[model samples]
Target: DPMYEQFLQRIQAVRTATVAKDISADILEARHDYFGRELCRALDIEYRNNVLLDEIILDVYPGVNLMEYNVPHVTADNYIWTGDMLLILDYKVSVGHDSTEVTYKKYTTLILPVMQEIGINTEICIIRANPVTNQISIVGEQFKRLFPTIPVELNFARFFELRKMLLDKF
Candidate 1:
């Protein structure tokens, strides 16, 4: 569990460095970016942030017609499309109404169609950190219910565990 310990230390170091600021959006967003980057680093996975679905389509499915589909303007945090599986690794500082519903809508209305058009499955692994309760865990039921057929993985906050999952999946 050395990687886990190292991730905790990285979190601690970030907290210590940013102790001056309260729990503002700026700070939370920064934390979100930091955690995603560190998680990918620890897992030794290629870390891509805020990737557009349109670009992915162009790369993998060029000249494909998607005029009927109402493509949502969504950018996945860490997008990994392996033809058969599309991994969206999202780091959430908190799961409020906007955060939760928006993600749900994006996956259902936009991401789903894009995946279908490209002939791949969409999987999201959300790593949530609740500063209020001092708890860090994966969002399970909250997102699972949204996708009945699609596989949704929750409770994946542990860096070591997620690393294992990535290794196994990829």
Candidate 2:
């Protein structure tokens, strides 16, 4: 019973911490780096950074190469890896534009192959967060839209799910 109760307590703490603390750094990357791109409608002067080039060398995973041509080097605004799930988190301030296409392309084309090559059938997800509101949308509909022809295991998660995974589980 102690183990079960501890698990309960752990999730509570995680839930509280995420909301109480200013995880704005970890929770919202796209907004912080938002440049007035093709889809940007806001006038954010601070949004000058981009996550596309934030490279990390994951030599442990096969087909994971950074700074190499023809290899997929990903720099997400925030990344979370559970035992069986991989989360690529981003923040979008504007609700008018859709990030589904970009998220779908990244995971399906490059990230999927990298994970497959490493024999890791981990559930890959792209989490979209509202940096300003700290809101998380599951976006499962967006997930289903990707890879219409190919059969795929869909893994879509929200902010609360992400915080839950950050606890004792992972």
Candidate 3:
């Protein structure tokens, strides 16, 4: 039990030492007060606090490492493995500097077989994070046209919003 506690302490130290300085550390750090040993904690404390993750893999959690290949692999910005559904949350910024909504159509189709095999429905939701208003994001209906009958869910918000939503729902 003592060693278990020590392991966690040591892991936190590792995060601090390695992630603390880098502006863009892969695995960020946090004290484990809120989201357990999850990426949310890493995003909450290490990266900019007020910023919802610009993008996250959730790294294909059911265990199929999505490839990046340094090719703008923004398959699903936000992800959740909810029962019978693989929730993919997408946000198009008010400031667009290479936004890839088109990628959604291709990737969404590609992941279907994998999800279906495991009986996990995949839902891709797009939201408008209006910069002028950090209040919240609303479901963008456009995704409907993008991927018809593709389990797309239009959605909304930002960093704190995501943290709150995940905390409450996830």
Candidate 4:
């Protein structure tokens, strides 16, 4: 039993270390660059800076070429999609330490709808870059509310279709 426990611990430690190494700052930067480049190609949008925001906007608006907005604060890092509803597509590697249950609730209830009312569709989706796990898990009524939409359907399909599309294109 003791040996088995030690084996488990060792495996866990190795797994953690491998994940940390894979997600190192340099590796993450490279991954971001690669993702941004691919997105630009797919969406046919160019970015002054090859950051997540730039790539994302380009990715969202495929086949449309758009000029880079040179506003200092208006970088691709923080983009605000505003209309009758605001769709804030936030990209994060991981939730911060201060992201408590209360904070999440506030976002889901008070913050999201208010943003939506102000012509913003706010969404917080995680991007796991290291090992390439395109897994997303959602909870509560928000899941029920959003899952019925075409975006969600596309999100699911994209995981599989992207590979096929790449193969077909190449």
Q: Taking the tens digit of each residue's C-alpha lDDT, what string does model 4 give over 1-170?
A: 45334433433444354544433443335434444444334333343332353344454444534343321222232233333222332222222323334334544554444333433345642222222343333233332353432221112222233323323332
Which candidate number has the best TM-score?
1
Predicted structure 2: lDDT: 0.41
Candidate 2 lDDT over residue span 19-131, tens digit each: 43444234333233332231122212123233542232252343554444445656554433434444444444433336756766765776656555555443444444344
Backbone clash pairs for candidate 3 read 52-159, 137-156, 137-157, 138-155, 139-154, 139-155
Give me the runs in candidate 2 sitting further than 4 Å from their true place: 1-70, 129-135, 140-170
Candidate 4's displacement at residue 60, Å, is 15
Q: Candidates ranked by lDDT, best first?
A: 1, 2, 3, 4
- TM for every model, in the order presented, reads 0.54, 0.38, 0.34, 0.30
lDDT of 4 at 7: 32
Worst 10 residues of 3 by lDDT: 26-35
lDDT of 1 at 45: 65
Cα lDDT computed for each candidate against the true fold = 0.55, 0.41, 0.38, 0.35
* RMSD of model 1 against the true structure: 10.9
Structural RMSD, model 2 = 15.3
Ranking by TM-score: 1, 2, 3, 4
Cα error, residue 110 of model 1, in Å, equals 1.9
lDDT of 1 by residue, 1-85 (tens): 5645654444444433243232233334655676667556655568777777666655555676656555567777765555556
How well does candidate 2 match the true structure in TM-score terms? 0.38
